[PDB]
């Protein structure tokens, strides 16, 4: 069974700020995901992969950044694309998608 749900919406980069990565997810020849939480509540899930997806060239970069923000617990800005909707979790109170960028930036800065 496939796990790719295309909403078909345009190339919009949706950004969620002041969020921390927890609850890692992984699978064989598939993606790696995470639940991002703010103020003790879950906001959005994001995923990366080398095998499938139109963001296949992303992984070899994103993962490295990802690792850092999980081992130091840095609150970052997560940039997500809604062209692909994922359900890799169970009994989820959120939505899981394809990760597209990370931005560790000071508040109110043009480099976010």
């Amino acid at each position, epitope marked *: 069974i496939m796990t790719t749900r295309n909403t078909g919406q*345009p190339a919009t980069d*949706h*950004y*969620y700020s*002041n969020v921390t990565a927890t609850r890692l997810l992984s699978s064989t020849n598939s993606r790696l995901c995470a639940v991002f939480v703010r103020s003790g509540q879950p906001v*959005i899930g994001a995923c990366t992969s080398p095998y499938d997806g139109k963001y296949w060239s992303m992984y070899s970069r994103l993962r490295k950044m990802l690792y850092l923000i999980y081992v130091a617990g840095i609150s970052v*800005r997560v940039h997500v694309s809604k062209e692909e909707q994922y359900y890799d979790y169970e009994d989820a*109170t959120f939505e899981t998608y394809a990760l597209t960028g990370i931005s560790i930036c000071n508040p*109110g800065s043009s480099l976010c």
Partner: T-cell receptor
Amino acid sequence: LVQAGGEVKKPGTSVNVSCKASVYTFTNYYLHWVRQAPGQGLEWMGVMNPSGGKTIYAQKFQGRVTTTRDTSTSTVYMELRSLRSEDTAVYYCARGLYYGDSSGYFGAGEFDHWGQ
Amino acid sequence: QAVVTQEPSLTVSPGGTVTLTCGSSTGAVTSGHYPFWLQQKPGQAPRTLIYDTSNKHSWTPARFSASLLGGKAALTLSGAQPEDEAEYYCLLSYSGARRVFGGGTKLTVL
């Protein structure tokens, strides 16, 4: 979250309405000022932003409605002037979006919290 | 000065599907207009139902859906249970963070 009591005025006067919430909600969220006339549909007045310091209004209320914010009381104050006959109504403050996010969000979203 | 037209009232017998539509006088409603649908119970503050024409909140029952239909922002309710009598509103977005509501619809089932 919580609202003030009722108030009856005369034509030509001004009204001040209070809307209080928690410190976190008061600090990091947009608010929408909305009114509702009896037996009528809703009408959307304006949107107020913490960081910007300015309130965006429809052209109808440009220059006659004022919004102020109190961090000591953590309460938003709405002031209305130049009253007319039909403006008798109930008034609401509504919780909007987070500071740095876009719209799409499952647990929380636009218009998720209204006062009484 | 954009105005939004919306249905005054509708009613279909239990178990049916009811379609509501809202439209703008400025032209055909697209995905950039950001349709919103709000829900109000009697004697209670209104509750948001749907945003961005495709997104369902956690409190939204799975019997509601939203889309575009004939260049009109449309909602469809299937399996009309006899408890969802309510008062509905459409919301369209315009440049400058300008939101315009409709007239509202007293959706009462018989």
